[PDB]
Write a protein that binds this ligand. Structure first.
Ligand code: ZN
Ligand code: ZN
Lengths: 496, 496
């Protein structure tokens, strides 16, 4: 039978060098009390002279009570595929651990393929665990089905705050693997192809820890004119494309990242009457989506996690009557699947840390060296979307930093994949343009006035060829930031 | 009824500013006499003071009697999505025309989406054209079905050398477009999902030009120890992976580029008994594949074109009894489809112009500025393959040029997509490794001895962060080639 234990007893099932997979996608759906117990245990081993580090496989980001505590404990032998915690991020950038970010849709199958070793244990947060081994996830799916299948033992965390009435909001499954794989039967963003729970051998459950962990509440989200501008441009562009005949009149499924811009984009879409009621086929469903949903603005939402504030999650749970049939959570293997994304003609909208005049995007490394979060699913989406869009305020640091540079210090998306770029200044449709033509378009429409003439001068430095990159000074902007702290101080005659 | 005309009369149906789509993939399946007649016509307009340039949509590369003649005629207003002709290449690199290379699998649908204007006329090479508008392609498919559907008028070229007995070797079709698209029903590389011909309204055929154009013959293909080495490493790695459990015992579908390395790889596979009889799910089927096919080494071949020498094509046509059911040609929309590639677990092997120590690949720009051919289908494949492999001799120009550099002068494939790199020196499995770990692996296994210590010194230049790129000298190798002509002359203390 199912054995109930403490977070301390559960932590004993994790040993040094073990590879652990965690449930959830973003803090949502992730274990919150056991990982901290592992950390104590890990630290107690360190100061005793004994080594203690585990390999970590997750869906995406985890709370501060996962990566944070584990990172502060210096017990991370390796991490994948996406993170978003300051402690772990520093540990990484200080070269104190091994981190490799992957396209989110690929981790599950690659685990099955045996590309990354063994999964020793799986720690999961649940809304309900049956005696016959049926698991009901909470608010995030990630790689749940795969870690439960591959793990030697499973440590369950039964959260008080998530009701079993949620049953039906998840669509869990895995496909056969080559050479036996069939198609993934989703032709609409609301199609169900799996089960509302994951089935495992109850014998693998080494224990069930009871918890009662509420969602955090929404923390300070001020409005910003630059993002208001960006969000409007996105919405206006899209309606404009439909009437131009480049997007079907009934619109298409959408995908957006998380953040202020995303929020502004969603708000703009909802307020533009020319944008028909739409569905989401995203990664994470945020408050902004729920808000539009209550106004009938968004008809349905497909995602990998429901990452909403406490006020919003309580409203949903109090109204399963309304939300149950409008929200569907899938493993990232499906929510970010190239096959599904391309078939449905999902329109993707993602952010850029920086972009260059030839349409290349950097979404992970600051100055090309410091890791940020991870490529995430921006590649899975951008690459296969009907039309890929990248948004970003034109400048930063009171204008001393330009979001647009001659060449990105780190390439995450290439000229062959980025179709449209949008800032507060306007939109640059890159389709059908060569390098020089898209540079002028990006310069005139997206770049901040303070940097437009300088980037125009970059295109006239005498370089011959398809792409006018000047290897002697393509990184002058980044170099100048390090020297003066203000990229506007660049003068090409100084960098050559 | 079908009207038979000359290449000169046919050329009259093409006007300045018209967008023309051509059939075929690589010279194979492309028109050979009409485009030259357009060129004459174009030149006659130029010297008369009148403008004359057409937009060009093709599958991939075309003969010298297509891009070459058209480029020499300076009648190219814009070109897509891949080219491989010296005249056109120079025209491009001299900034005399607009060229934009795309992921091959995306051109067909994006044309239907309306992303690139209108298709005025389609010039196609045929083995048979029925009176009721049934077209039978020759040796290359490309974007045939799409250009025939979208074009206002069609100019057919009936080639004597290709028999209608070929009927059955093509699988032609197009899928519905979002939001109505269904799955692409190919679960095996030999699955048929379309028709052996393309149906059009005979009224659109403005004329049929009779031709008799034979395949070129195989031209000088000497053996090279470096490629022999590379090919063996690829084959040995693969058998090694199967026994390690990272590739199913019965193997998987393969995809390789064209060239000496590719030929060596195919040969190595055929000669390694631990490599089971396999199938191809490539872009272009070359002589090397046919050779292995006759030895039962390759069981079947799926591709977009059969680009073989005259000796080989005659052997096939004289033995449809053997080849007919073993070769299947598809539109690049299907032969390079992400959905199919990932579902079948296609193992992809492509070349690299250059690669950097962090796993990024450049497959198009020399020194980051001079266009080569185009990204081609390397992205469609690499990105979605079971395991992506990149091959390349370690050096060039008698060792004065290193194929491995600190940072690639042009990014076509990122660290998140490149899984394995192989040179004559060994193989570097990049999976599960962070930037520093994969740099040391690439340095120790793939890099030529003459450059290993220098790239090791690059990793110790004091740079902090996830990725040790030094923006002050990451391009020193390229810069030194331009200064001395020998990258070995680099000394980091000189570039900083
Ligand atoms: Zn990256
Ligand atoms: Zn490129």
């Amino acid at each position: 039978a199912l054995r109930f234990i403490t977070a301390e007893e559960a932590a004993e099932f994790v040993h040094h060098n073990d590879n652990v997979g965690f449930s959830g996608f973003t803090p949502a759906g992730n274990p919150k009390v056991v990982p901290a117990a592992i950390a104590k245990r890990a630290i107690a081993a360190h100061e005793k002279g004994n080594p203690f580090k585990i390999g970590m496989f997750t869906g995406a980001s985890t709370g501060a009570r996962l990566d944070g505590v584990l990172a502060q404990a210096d017990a991370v032998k390796f991490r994948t595929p996406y993170q978003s915690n300051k402690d772990l991020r520093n540990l990484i950038n200080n070269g104190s651990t091994s981190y490799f970010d992957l396209h989110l849709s690929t981790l599950a199958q690659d685990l099955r393929y045996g590309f990354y070793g063994k999964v020793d244990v799986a720690i999961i947060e649940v809304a309900d665990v049956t005696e016959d081994g049926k698991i009901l996830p909470t608010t995030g799916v990630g790689i749940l089905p795969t870690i439960c299948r591959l793990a030697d033992r499973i440590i369950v965390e039964l959260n008080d705050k998530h009701p079993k009435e949620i049953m039906g909001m998840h669509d869990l499954c895995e496909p056969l693997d080559p050479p036996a794989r069939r198609e993934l039967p989703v032709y609409t963003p609301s199609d169900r192809i799996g089960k509302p729970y994951v089935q495992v051998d109850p014998a693998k459950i080494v224990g069930v820890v009871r918890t009662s962990e509420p969602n955090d509440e929404s923390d300070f989200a001020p409005l910003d004119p630059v993002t208001q501008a960006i969000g409007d441009n996105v919405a206006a562009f899209l309606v404009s494309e439909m009437k131009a005949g480049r997007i079907p009149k009934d619109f298409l499924p959408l995908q957006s990242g998380v953040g202020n811009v995303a929020n502004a984009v969603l708000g703009a879409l909802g307020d533009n009457p020319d944008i028909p009621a739409f569905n989401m086929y995203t990664e994470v469903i945020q408050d902004a989506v729920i808000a539009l949903m209550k106004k009938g603005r968004i008809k349905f939402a497909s995602g990998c996690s429901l990452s909403v504030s406490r006020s919003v999650i309580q409203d949903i749970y109090a109204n399963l009557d309304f939300f149950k049939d409008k929200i569907l959570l899938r493993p990232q293997e499906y929510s970010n699947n190239p096959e599904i994304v391309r078939r449905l003609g999902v329109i993707t909208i993602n952010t850029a840390l920086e972009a260059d005049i030839f349409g290349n995007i950097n979404s992970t490394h600051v100055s090309g060296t410091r890791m940020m979060n991870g490529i995430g699913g921006s590649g899975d989406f951008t690459r296969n979307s009907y039309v890929s869009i990248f948004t970003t305020p034109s400048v930063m640091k009171d204008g001393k930093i330009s979001s647009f540079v001659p060449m990105v210090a780190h390439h995450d998306h290439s000229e062959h994949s980025v179709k449209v770029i949008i800032s507060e200044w306007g939109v640059a449709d890159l389709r059908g343009k060569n390098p020089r033509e898209r540079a002028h378009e990006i310069i005139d429409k997206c770049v901040h006035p303070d940097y437009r003439p300088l980037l125009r001068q970059y295109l006239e430095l005498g370089v011959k060829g398809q792409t006018p990159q000047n290897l002697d000074c393509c990184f002058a902007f980044h170099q100048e930031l390090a020297k003066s702290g203000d990229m506007r101080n660049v003068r090409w005659e100084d960098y050559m």
